[PDB]
């Protein structure tokens, strides 16, 4: 008369979706953070080399 | 520490032209400045690789 098991299955299935996409998006945004910092190091080194030659 | 004394010796000994020490002074200058360019360039490359590790 009180469907508690279907309620728990629904809550856990809505809660697994969010865990999956958080774990997927966080790794990719951290990778983009690493790439942007690497690009800023390469930019600094190139413009400093040309500055010292000039 | 080495360059600031060899260049002061160059300013001291050649207030007037000294033809006897003129062939060796040029070799000392070339040697110490070519040593310094290599050391300064490797120090910059080491600091850059250290900055790219974070």
Curated annotation (Swiss-Prot), chain B:
Subcellular location: Secreted; Periplasm; Host cell membrane
Induction and repression of expression: During anaerobic growth. Weakly or not expressed in most strains. It is activated by SlyA, while it is silenced by H-NS. Its expression is also regulated by CRP and FNR.
Free-text description of this protein's post-translational modifications in UniProt: In outer membrane vesicles, the redox status prevents formation of the disulfide bond, leading to oligomerization and pore formation.
Range of residues in the leader sequence: none
Subunit structure: Monomer and oligomer. In periplasm, it is present as a monomer, while in outer membrane vesicles, it oligomerizes to form a pore structure that is active. The pore is formed by a dodecamer.
The family this protein is said to belong to: Belongs to the hemolysin E family.
Protein task: Toxin, which has some hemolytic activity towards mammalian cells. Acts by forming a pore-like structure upon contact with mammalian cells.
The protein's name in its UniProt record: Hemolysin E, chromosomal
Species of provenance: Escherichia coli (strain K12)
Gene: hlyE
Section covered of the full-length record: 88 to 141 of 303
């Amino acid at each position: 008369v009180i469907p508690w098991q279907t309620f728990d299955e629904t809550i856990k299935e809505l809660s697994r979706f969010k865990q999956e996409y958080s774990q997927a998006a966080s790794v990719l945004v951290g990778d983009i953070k690493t790439l942007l910092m690497d690009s800023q190091d390469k930019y600094f080194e190139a413009t400093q080399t040309v500055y010292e030659w000039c | 520490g080495v360059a600031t004394q060899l260049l002061a010796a160059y300013i001291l000994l050649f207030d007037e032209y000294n033809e006897k020490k003129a062939s060796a002074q040029k070799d000392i200058l070339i040697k110490v400045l070519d040593d310094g360019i290599t050391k300064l360039n490797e120090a910059q490359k080491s600091l850059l690789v250290s900055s790219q590790s974070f």
